[PDB]
Design goal:
This is part of a larger assembly, with one copy of chain A, two copies of chain B, one copy of chain D and one copy of chain E. By secondary structure, chain A is mainly alpha-helical. Chain A is 74% helix and 0% strand. By secondary structure, chain B is mainly beta. In chain B, strands 1-2 form a two-stranded antiparallel ribbon. Chain B starts with 23 loop residues before the first strand and ends in a 14-residue tail after the last strand. By secondary structure, chain D is mostly helical. Chain D is 70% helix and 0% strand. In chain D, helix 2 crosses helix 3 and helix 3 crosses helix 4. The longest helix of chain D is centred in the middle third of the chain and has 26 residues. The relative contact order of chain D is 0.10. By secondary structure, chain E is mainly alpha-helical. In chain E, 66% of the residues lie in helices and 3% in strands. Chain E is built from 18 helices and six strands. Classes of the chains: A mainly alpha, B mainly beta, D mainly alpha, E mainly alpha. At the C-E interface, helix 1 of C face helix 11 and helix 14 of E.
């Protein structure tokens, strides 16, 4: 009914959205925190996935009501875009389970874990839509002051990423045919760089590299570690301290 | 000149693999036992 | 005893000239682009 | 010509877009070639070689870049700000061609250090944002 | 009563150029098919090379005798109707060429000549030459087809460009010339690709001697299929532009905008006198003649050069020449047109630009010669077969046993790096083939050899074809040929743009044809004689044992051919450079006289 249907949808959306969405997503988060709970799923596994599919049907009804709803400004909310993506993945996995047959592997495959973390995203969305009331103003102000200095921390993490990529490149270049079994590829190289970055067994790296024949890589590793460590942590600590400090200087 | 009458059928080994030259003792009717001693391998003409 | 090994190696074609052709092709395309920009700028430098 | 041509090619947005595109394409291609230099994919072997020779073509693009730099103040540019460091890094990045044409790199090649030097120059000559610039100024002070 | 907007949009200049592009495309495809069809007809249908040169010359002399006449006729009449007549004659020509390949496919088959050859004898299947009868009729058909091909195609290339000159502004004349030349080039590519995708044998290439008879049927069937479709397309396009109006609306609008702000023999003589009086036209004509000479020499010589130096199969060498002379050529033509169109490019600067392009092309040819001085793997010509026999020992008992003919000898590669001509002469009485490779078994006339080889089910299997260990010069040579083709196609567009400037609008119709009469007569007629003389200078060692009157050589002197052909090309390019350096001063003098500032 065009704009008339839109205004009816606005009023009845306020009323019914409040009542129904709050009650059914409260029950959804109840059954979903009962679901994960890796002791009670053996006291279950048969009343769990059926209620999971029932409340996924409730969620696809939510997305249907939002699709027949006002439309373009609905997409202008990033949380609503996350709803749309989550529901696209939900109808995808629901029809994938529904068609059966198939020709690929199943019985708790990696794709099943992808659907499980999609269910985790759905649970997080349920949690975020039950906190419309009483987020508490103290932590609201704390988070608002925390999120004030976004460009500074994004620039600092960009510098971290560039420095870490450079260090990984030079280390993998210097670790060729030097028992690279721990860092034979790019993922393991960046993970080992993360371990050096996070004070995790770099002394062990020194002691099992001393068992090897190369030594200068150890001064190279400590000098890179200390410069990136001191520079990054001093930068972030100082930046966030001053970021809350000018808000302290106000009321 | 290689051949088979005094050099045998050559191996058709692929890219770098691991081979242990292991030899057994045989006489008259058939094989006796597996040989364990101390070997030396050497090329016919000479390489390094 | 006798035994021979013929292992397959990892010596491929150098292919240095096959890609030197690509080097020369890219260099000539870059020179042609530079010449075209040269002619365009001699057309549009009398305005200044 | 000469310095006027350098000013024009620095003013033109097409040349800047082309050189930054070549820079990030070279950085992305650089780590791919070190992953596999074997016969795992026979159909991908000549094209991976052509990608390495495309990297050699980026080195020749650095040659024409220092040629455009000769159109600048020339002898005055030998002692300057971080641009002379960029010039030195580009010279060190042209060095591997010379040390593979005549050096017979079955030795302590040290091509990796020059490679990471040209990477760090490429990771700094990426049209750094102002938010990066203010915090870098704060860091240097 | 066709007053639809489709008609009102098809009479636009773009409506004419789309049709002209299609016509030039199908003409190029037809000519590309026809050239290789005539070549393989001479190869297969038991004739000589002289007759091949004869009906190759027939097309050229038909173009020469039709160019001036059709230019004079189109200077006084409607160009569209003459274009329609030429297209209809072309559509007749395609079917006239198709007809012998379907009517007379019983001339020389492998075994179908039941009257004089029996299946139980092998010597009788290659004698009793009944193929010589019923061949002169095909010669007459081919010579008539080449004549009507010239008479139908040359007026198209005259009158379409004349319409471009007289109905398009000079800002798009270069673009239309470039896209027309590119359409001709891509027709030359497409016809060659389509002809070689069907003339080449099916994947069952290595079967019993019924395979040459199957290929004999298949090539004729492919030509009969292709020429009929070409004729149908030509007839449909002719019917399409017959419907085009004589008085174009866009041309009338342009003539109205430009209006503001008898072809007697005496007029012909006055025009000829004006062309001869201005040496600019003479210089451009000789430059175009030399450019066409160099282009034709390179196109005829490159497959032979690849065959004799880089050890390539002549069909594969011809494919490498044809499919790689195109990407340089079309890009060079497009760039040459677009520079003049975008930059509003002037006459004196056109001369300067042509001189610069010619200088860099000369330098590139010099670099090609410097690369050609490098050494390569040598096959044959090893100063007698290792002391066992002389040059002339090819007719041995191993030649006589398996009945080899010295006109189809190829090069087999021994495992001891020695290449031997005539793989059946190597003593191999057993021939077991695989799906993807030919090889010869049980060779007895070969030397000791047998170095490494490789086989699974048996052994002693000499691989077929020419083996190469150093063939990396070919990509560099192909890149240099790319650049040479780019800069060779880049010079003709400014020359043709110069042609329009010195001629008034009404007299522009003859200006192409006056040049074009020099294209086919002064250039294309004496060129093959010089090519044959240079080849015979290089091909000293003819097969005098069987061929007789120089029908097939074996030793193509690599250094001699390279030196002679590069000397000829450098002489032509230096002639072009000298003509351009004369014309620059001549045009400067004429401009100063007409300006007198």
């Amino acid at each position: 009914l065009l704009g008339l249907q839109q205004m009816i949808l606005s009023l009845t959306q306020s009323l019914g959205f409040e009542t129904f969405i709050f009650i059914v997503v409260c029950l959804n988060t109840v059954i979903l925190v009962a679901q994960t709970f890796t002791e009670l799923e053996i006291r279950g596994e048969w009343y769990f996935m059926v209620l999971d599919s029932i409340f996924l049907s409730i969620y696809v009804l939510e997305a249907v009501l939002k699709l027949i709803a006002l439309g373009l400004e609905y997409f202008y909310d990033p949380w609503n875009n996350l709803d749309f993506f989550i529901m696209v993945m939900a109808v995808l996995d629901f029809v994938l389970l529904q068609i059966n047959s198939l020709s690929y592997s199943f019985y708790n495959h990696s794709l099943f874990r992808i659907l499980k973390v999609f269910k985790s995203m759905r649970a997080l969305r349920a949690i975020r839509v039950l906190r419309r009331l009483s987020i508490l103003t103290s932590l609201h102000e704390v988070a608002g002051t925390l999120s004030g200095s976004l460009p500074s921390i994004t620039a600092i993490l960009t510098l971290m990423f560039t420095c870490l990529f450079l260090f990984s490149v030079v280390l993998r270049a210097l670790f060729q045919d030097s028992d690279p079994k721990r860092f034979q590829n790019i993922f393991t190289t960046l993970f080992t760089l993360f371990t050096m970055l996070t004070l995790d067994d770099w002394s062990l790296i020194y002691i099992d590299n001393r068992a090897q024949g190369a030594w200068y890589i150890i001064p190279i590793l400590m000098i890179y570690i200390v410069i990136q460590y001191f520079i990054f942590l001093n930068l972030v600590i100082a930046v966030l301290v001053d970021n809350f400090q000018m808000a302290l200087l106000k009321g | 000149r290689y051949d088979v009458a005094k050099y045998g059928c050559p191996l058709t080994l692929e890219l770098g693999q691991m081979f242990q030259p292991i030899v057994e003792l045989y006489d008259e009717n058939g094989f006796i036992k597996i040989v364990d001693a101390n070997f030396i391998l050497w090329e016919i003409h000479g390489r390094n | 005893t006798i035994f021979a090994i013929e292992s397959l190696g990892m010596i491929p074609r150098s292919s240095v000239y096959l890609v030197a052709a690509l080097i020369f092709v890219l260099m000539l395309t870059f020179i042609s682009i530079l010449v075209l920009s040269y002619f365009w700028y001699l057309k549009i430098y009398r305005q200044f | 010509p000469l310095s006027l041509w350098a000013g024009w090619v620095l003013d033109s947005s097409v040349f800047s877009k082309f050189i930054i595109s070549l820079i990030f394409l070279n950085t992305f291609v650089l780590m791919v070639e070190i992953e596999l230099m074997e016969s795992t994919n026979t159909a991908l072997w000549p094209v991976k070689l052509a990608l390495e020779v495309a990297d050699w073509f980026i080195l020749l693009s650095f040659i024409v870049e220092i040629l455009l730099m000769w159109l600048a103040s020339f002898s005055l540019f030998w002692k300057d700000a971080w641009n002379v460091f960029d010039f030195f890094v580009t010279l060190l990045s042209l060095l591997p061609e010379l040390v593979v044409l005549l050096g017979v790199p079955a030795h302590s090649v040290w091509l990796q250090l020059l490679r990471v030097c040209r990477v760090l120059r490429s990771l700094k000559l990426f049209a750094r944002f102002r938010q990066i610039k203010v915090i870098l100024l704060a860091l240097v002070r | 009563p066709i007053v639809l907007p489709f008609v009102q949009r098809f009479n636009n200049i773009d409506g004419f150029m789309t049709l002209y592009v299609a016509a030039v495309l199908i003409h190029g495809a037809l000519f590309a098919v026809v050239d290789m069809t005539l070549n393989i007809y001479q190869v297969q249908f038991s004739l000589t090379r002289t007759e091949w040169y004869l009906m190759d010359f027939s097309d050229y002399i038909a173009s020469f005798v039709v160019a001036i006449i059709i230019a004079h006729f189109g200077s006084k009449g409607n160009r569209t109707r003459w274009i329609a007549a030429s297209c209809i004659l072309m559509g007749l020509e395609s079917m006239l060429f198709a007809f012998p390949f379907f009517t007379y496919e019983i001339i020389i088959p492998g075994r179908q000549s039941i009257e004089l050859c029996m299946e139980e004898n092998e010597k009788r299947n290659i004698i009793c030459g009944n193929s010589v009868p019923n061949r002169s009729k095909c010669i007459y058909f081919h010579i008539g087809g080449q004549c009507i091909h010239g008479i139908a195609g040359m007026p198209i290339y005259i009158l379409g460009i004349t319409f471009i000159f007289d109905h398009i502004p000079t800002s798009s004349c270069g673009f239309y010339l470039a896209i027309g030349h590119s359409a001709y080039l891509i027709g030359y590519l497409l016809g060659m690709v389509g002809g070689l995708q069907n003339f080449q044998p099916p994947p069952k290439e290595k079967t019993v001697e019924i395979e040459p008879a199957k290929v004999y049927q298949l090539l004729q069937s492919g030509w009969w299929k292709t020429f009929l479709i070409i004729a149908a397309i030509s007839f449909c396009v002719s019917f399409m532009m017959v419907c085009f109006p004589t008085s174009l609306p866009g041309a009338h609008k342009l003539r109205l905008a430009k209006r503001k702000e008898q072809p007697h023999l005496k007029g012909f003589l006055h025009n000829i006198w004006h062309i001869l009086k201005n040496p600019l036209m003479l210089t451009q004509a000789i430059c175009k003649v030399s450019e066409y000479l160099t282009f034709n020499t390179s196109l005829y010589f490159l497959p032979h050069h690849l065959q004799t130096q880089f050890l390539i199969t002549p069909g594969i060498a011809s494919l490498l020449t044809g499919a790689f002379v195109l990407p340089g050529g079309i890009i060079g033509h497009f760039l040459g047109g677009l520079i003049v169109d975008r930059l509003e490019m002037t006459n004196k600067n056109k001369l300067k630009f042509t001189l610069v392009t010619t200088v860099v092309s000369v330098g590139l040819f010099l670099l090609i010669f410097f690369v050609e001085c490098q050494t390569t793997t040598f096959a044959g010509i090893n100063e007698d077969y290792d002391g066992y026999g002389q040059l002339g020992n090819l007719t041995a008992d191993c030649n006589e046993y398996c009945d080899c003919t010295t006109s189809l000898y190829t090069s087999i590669c021994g495992r001891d790096e020695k290449e031997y001509f005539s793989p059946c002469f190597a003593g191999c009485k057993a021939t077991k083939v695989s799906q993807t490779e030919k090889t010869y078994y049980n060779c007895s006339c070969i030397k000791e050899g047998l170095a490494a080889s490789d086989d699974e089910g048996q052994f002693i299997d000499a691989i077929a074809g020419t083996c190469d260990s150093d063939c990396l010069k070919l990509p560099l040579f192909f890149a240099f040929y790319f650049s040479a083709t780019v800069f060779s196609n880049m010079c003709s567009i400014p020359v043709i743009s110069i042609i329009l400037q010195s001629v008034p609008a009404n007299f522009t119709s003859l200006s192409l044809g006056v040049t074009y009469a020099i294209v086919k007569f002064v250039a294309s007629v004496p060129a093959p004689l010089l090519f044959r003389l240079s080849s015979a200078i290089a091909c000293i060692y003819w097969d005098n044992n069987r061929c007789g009157g120089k029908e097939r050589c074996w030793i193509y002197n690599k250094n001699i051919l390279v030196y002679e052909f590069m000397g000829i090309w450098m002489s032509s390019q230096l002639i072009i450079v000298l003509l351009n350096i004369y014309a620059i001063q001549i045009h400067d003098v004429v401009v100063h006289g007409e300006i007198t500032e």
